[PDB]
């Protein structure tokens, strides 16, 4: 089963106000445990096993100057299949803000599956 | 603790008893049950799996007297071992002739 969730950090700004959230690990202090899945760009390593509650992206925020990480909101543990760093077609060098993460989950036939 | 005696199914003197063995299935149960039913002192013998998912096997041995059902189980196991020995020897000796 392939499932795609779109992680977006541009949800909380408009009218050209500055980007307050930057993908990646900031200069503050964070526990290194988050390095299991996230890359130095705050993106999941492709093909990693993602449980529930494990981080799937890290964004250093200007509003608080503390590194905040998003989690996986699902029950079935998944594998990070692919990532699309969607860019915006604007003349400005607008930073990366929209990401499309697609995961695969192994649906081995369990008892109770309709055939 | 591979095999246990079910005190709630047995008899006082031992002339009838039930055994529960882990990690076994029809494969050992049927062989042992046939072999022990070949013993003349045993009245009622049978095998039962509580639930297929569980790896448990109960063997019911009710003798006719004169020998405790524990000993009947031991003799059945011995005769199973001897049967395996003879089939091994026969197959080995006949594989060389070919």
């Amino acid at each position: 089963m392939y499932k795609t969730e779109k992680v977006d950090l541009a949800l909380n700004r408009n009218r050209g106000d500055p980007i307050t959230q930057h993908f990646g690990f900031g200069n503050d202090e964070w526990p290194k445990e988050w390095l299991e899945k996230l890359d130095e760009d705050g993106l999941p390593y492709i093909g990693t096993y993602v449980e529930e509650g494990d981080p799937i992206c890290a964004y250093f925020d200007d509003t608080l100057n503390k590194t905040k990480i998003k989690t996986y909101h699902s029950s079935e543990p998944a594998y990070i299949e692919e990532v699309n760093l969607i860019g915006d077609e604007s003349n400005k060098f607008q930073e990366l803000q929209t990401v499309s993460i697609k995961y695969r989950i192994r649906r081995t036939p369990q008892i109770g599956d309709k055939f | 603790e591979k095999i246990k005696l079910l005190t709630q199914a047995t008899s006082e003197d031992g002339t009838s008893a039930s055994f529960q063995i882990v990690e076994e299935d029809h494969t050992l149960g049927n062989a042992l049950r046939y072999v022990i039913m070949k013993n003349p002192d045993v009245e009622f013998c049978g095998y039962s799996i509580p639930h297929p998912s569980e790896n448990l096997l109960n063997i019911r041995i009710q003798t006719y007297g004169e020998t405790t059902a524990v000993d009947a189980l031991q003799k059945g196991l011995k005769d199973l071992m001897d049967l395996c020995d003879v089939v091994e020897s026969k197959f080995t000796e006949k594989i060389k002739s070919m």
Partner: protein, 44 residues
Amino acid sequence: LKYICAECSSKLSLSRTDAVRCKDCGHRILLKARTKRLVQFEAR
């Protein structure tokens, strides 16, 4: 290099604050590359 253009397949990289764009062609979609890391499995 950790990214790949979704159009011309040419590998590329991204700087901090830098625009999300393929250098060699007009594309702004960048797949994340797969790097060398341990991933375990079980053949079941």
